[PDB]
């Protein structure tokens, strides 16, 4: 379980006003969004499990996004990106908390695995680090990530339990394609599953076959679930695709 908030200001010459777009995610699914180019300069719900919040929630949230627009690059087609969030396990306890920045999608200043120090990946960003660690931004962020980010994530998980903990099992297939007379590719599919985290591993005769196996990264479907496949090239020969998902009592073994 993870809730992330993204804030980006795509700079514009001539237009004068940088495009500030803000999004919030829970388990990779969007639930809030703000856009300076939108018709109404207010943040909206993009999930049905948060429209239930009262009007004080939105106006409380909308005013905070406006402040972040002014201070997006306070201490930093130029694109400035911001991210923060927290990760949570099935215990519903804190795992890992992030607070990161990028300058044109190159890492600029990122909060370490321990929520205490910053990793300046750009030499221009080391004054930013010297400023923040003198301002103790880490301690103030540690309170929010360990305290506030998790608590509302728990509430969001309760509010959208029909959505976030859906734990759909993968609708799995095995597809075989003859690429040549002497070899073929065996593709094992993972369709309509949730969460996106899945492991598809190939084995020959019961031992791993990583060196000759290709795959594709998990694909968001239009439904709200995800897709993935991994393929191995066989010289014809029986190989097994192991599917490991949260929605399965036992990992599956597939054969052609």
């Amino acid at each position: 379980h993870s809730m992330r908030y993204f804030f980006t200001s795509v700079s514009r010459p001539g237009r004068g006003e940088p495009r500030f777009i803000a999004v919030g995610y829970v388990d990779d699914t969007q639930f809030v969004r703000f856009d300076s180019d939108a018709a109404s300069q207010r943040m909206e719900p993009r999930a049905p499990w948060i429209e239930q919040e009262g009007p004080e929630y939105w106006d409380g949230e909308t005013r905070k996004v406006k402040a972040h627009s002014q201070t997006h690059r306070v201490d930093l087609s130029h694109t400035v990106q911001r991210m923060y969030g927290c990760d949570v396990g099935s215990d519903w306890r804190f795992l890992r908390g992030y607070h990161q920045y990028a300058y044109d999608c190159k890492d600029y200043i990122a909060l370490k695995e321990d929520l205490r120090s910053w990793t300046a990946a750009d030499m221009a960003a080391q004054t930013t680090k010297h400023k923040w660690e003198a301002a103790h931004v880490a301690e103030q962020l540690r309170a929010y990530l360990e305290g506030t980010c998790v608590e509302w994530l728990r509430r969001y998980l309760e509010n959208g339990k029909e959505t976030l903990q859906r734990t759909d099992a993968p609708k799995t297939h095995m597809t075989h394609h003859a690429v040549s007379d002497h070899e073929a590719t065996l593709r094992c599919w993972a369709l309509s599953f949730y969460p996106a985290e899945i492991t598809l591993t190939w084995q020959r005769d019961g031992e791993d076959q990583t060196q000759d196996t290709e795959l594709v990264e998990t694909r968001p479907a239009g439904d709200g679930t995800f897709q993935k496949w991994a393929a191995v090239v066989v010289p014809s020969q029986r190989y097994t695709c192991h599917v490991q998902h949260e929605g399965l009592p036992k990992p599956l073994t597939l054969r052609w």
Partner: peptide, 6 residues
């Protein structure tokens, strides 16, 4: 919720 403070 958004971070809130500056």
């Amino acid at each position: 919720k958004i971070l809130g403070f500056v």
